[PDB]
Ligand binder design. Structure first.
Ligand code: FAD
Ligand SMILES: *[C@@H]1O[C@H](CO)[C@@H](O[C@@H]2O[C@H](CO)[C@@H](O)[C@H](O)[C@H]2NC(C)=O)[C@H](O)[C@H]1NC(C)=O
Ligand code: ZIP
Ligand code: NAG
Ligand code: NAG
Ligand code: NAG
Length: 498
């Protein structure tokens, strides 16, 4: 027996069971796992979301799990609702009116629908001379999707993750109740939802902090053959000054294994063939099995004196560093071209047929005290003698910029590294080898007693999720699940309560 508001969605053709609808909502970016839903909802408004979730809340014995598909960038089925209902979030942004992205009158924040993609949040913000302060490396992800994880990039050391740059949200709980939440209003829901893995409700609107939009980014790469010098410099560039930070707007880093060195440097799209020859000769001279590169930017505007001020500011910061003499490499681009840089890698890989392939990505947070051990056992150990396809990203984060009361789990140390090994299974049937190598890396960290946290991964065992949050923080997560999704129907693909 269906409620009238739920039956109206099927009448209006918003609730589909056809093979085309279910097939599209059954695969994700990871391209490793698949799960067909029973139905797909294409909501035209937030009232359609209220109708589905209230039906779920009031119907006794309701058997359908519900997932909120952003862009399906999930790696291991986190956006699937096996034999359930997948919400096609993008349908909320179909009409020309009402607008889904509103920059505030005062220009201090930006209101964006949960379904909206960060690239559109950027374009709408830039039209009003503003931009969010904390980003992901890839802009074709949804506001609600990244906020359900953390949302990290080279800006998070100073501005914190995307979850630390949200003023307020509109959420529809598992009870079908539309609640506006912040630190001052319904704080418990606001904190549970940020990094909440879609467990407590759907974010329909997020109010994102903005800053005056820079016009350009001075973009640098610094080369090292010594991991200790590389990691020490990343920490210097990202350390809090004796609340204040250094001038860098973005700090990331990358690891290049010797075996494929020339090809990998040439594939960054940053280095010229002359730059490549020099770094390859440097590696041979130092007899390095690994090469490290700091990637950093300095944001600046259209002011007449800006270019010279940046040259001086950059010359000053570089003098404090310990990269191999003469191995500083500069580029200067428009701010939006820098932010949207990964979209170019997508275009080039898609035409080669190397984008829509399995992505057995390994993403983790490694405490600073164990990063050199990780480098020895992984970059200089396990990954040696292998053909790597995908970037190996390493960069420090400041725990002070993360709110531990939110759902997102991080290591206890003040400084911890985001470690992103973006393996693409390009070779014929290389998937099984990559999945085993990820199990080996994790086993190496477990045996060495490294207290890491995974990021973007879903655990399949209860004991793993309990260790992921930590026992006390886990009990708190359960408290919020009981309050907001007692029926355990939301985002079943996380495998926390399903
Ligand atoms: C594929 C990809 C992912 C990625 C990235 C680059 C690429 C090519 N770069 C990232 C980066 O630099 N930093 C970062 O923190 N994450 C990065 N990612 C991962 C990305 O954040 C995740 O894939 C995330 O899931 C966002 O993707 P998407 O927007 O496509 O969301 P989804 O996969 O469909 O769903 C994820 C889970 O969240 C729940 N969900 C989705 N939308 C909502 C809303 N509006 N409200 C509540 N929950 C929501 C889903 O149910 C699912 O469980
Ligand atoms: C870095 O990797 C390269 C392979 O690209 C190694 O260079 C090869 O080494 C073997 C063994 O002496 C030679 O037979 C090949 O002809 C070399 N190839 C090229 C393209 O130069 C090199 O040994 C590696 N360095 C380290 C420190 O492992
Ligand atoms: C945290 C995370 C998975 C970041 C991913 N970033 C990227 N994802 C995919 N391709 C990339 N190239 C450079 N950076 C890339
Ligand atoms: C992965 O993508 C390929 C090519 O688009 C497709 O044939 C296959 O169904 C996908 N597999 C999974 C498990 O999603
Ligand atoms: C944007 O503002 C309009 C009013 O101008 C409103 O109807 C709409 O709900 C807003 N969109 C978001 C995402 O807040
Ligand atoms: C170069 O480094 C390799 C790999 O670590 C090692 O086998 C070899 O002893 C080194 N050669 C010299 C001359 O140090």
């Amino acid at each position: 027996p269906w409620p009238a508001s739920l039956a109206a969605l099927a009448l209006d053709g918003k609730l589909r069971t056809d093979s085309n609808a279910t097939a599209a909502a059954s695969t994700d970016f990871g391209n490793i796992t698949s799960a067909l839903p029973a139905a797909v909802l294409y909501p035209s408004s937030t009232a359609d979301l209220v109708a589905l979730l209230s039906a779920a809340n009031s119907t006794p014995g309701w058997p359908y799990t519900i997932a909120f598909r952003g862009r399906g960038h999930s790696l291991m089925g986190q956006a699937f609702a096996p034999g359930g209902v997948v919400v096609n979030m993008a349908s909320l942004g179909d009409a020309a009116a009402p607008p889904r992205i509103n920059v505030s009158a005062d220009g201090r924040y930006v209101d964006a629908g949960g379904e909206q993609v960060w690239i559109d949040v950027l374009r709408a913000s830039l039209a009003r001379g503003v931009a969010p302060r904390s980003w992901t490396e890839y802009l074709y992800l949804t506001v609600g999707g990244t906020l359900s994880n953390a949302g990290i990039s080279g800006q998070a050391f100073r501005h914190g993750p995307q979850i630390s740059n949200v003023l307020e949200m509109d959420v529809i709980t598992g009870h079908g109740e539309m609640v506006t939440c912040s630190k001052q209003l319904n704080a418990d829901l606001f904190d549970a939802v940020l990094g909440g893995l879609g467990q407590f409700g759907v974010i329909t609107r997020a109010r994102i902090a903005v800053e005056p939009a820079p016009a350009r980014a001075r973009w640098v790469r610094l080369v090292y053959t010594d991991f200790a010098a590389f990691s020490a410099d990343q920490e210097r560039l990202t350390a809090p000054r004796p609340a204040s930070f250094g001038p860098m707007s973005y700090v990331e880093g990358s690891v290049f294994v010797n075996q494929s060195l020339a090809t990998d440097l040439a594939n960054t799209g940053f280095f010229t063939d002359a730059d490549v020859a020099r770094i390859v000769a440097l590696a041979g001279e130092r007899n390095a099995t690994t090469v490290y590169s700091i990637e950093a930017t300095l944001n600046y505007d259209n002011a007449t004196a800006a270019a010279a001020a940046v040259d001086q500011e950059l010359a000053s910061v570089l003098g404090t560093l310990s990269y191999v003499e003469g191995f500083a490499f500069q580029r200067d681009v428009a701010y939006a071209a820098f932010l949207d840089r990964v979209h170019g890698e997508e275009v080039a890989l898609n035409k080669l047929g190397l984008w829509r392939v399995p992505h057995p990505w390994l993403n983790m947070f490694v405490p600073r005290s164990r990063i050199a051990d990780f480098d020895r056992g992984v970059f200089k150990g396990i990954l040696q003698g292998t053909d790597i396809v995908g970037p190996l990203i390493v960069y420090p984060l400041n725990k002070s910029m993360w709110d531990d009361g939110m759902s997102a789990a991080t290591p206890s140390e003040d400084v911890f590294y985001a470690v992103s090994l973006l393996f693409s299974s390009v070779a014929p049937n290389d998937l099984a080898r990559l999945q085993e190598q990820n199990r080996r890396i994790l086993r190496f960290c477990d045996l060495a007693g490294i207290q890491y946290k995974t990021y973007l991964a879903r655990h399949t065992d209860r004991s793993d999720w309990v260790r992921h949050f930590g026992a006390a923080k886990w009990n708190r997560f359960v408290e919020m699940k009981n309050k907001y999704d007692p029926k355990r129907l939301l985002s079943p693909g996380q495998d926390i309560f399903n």
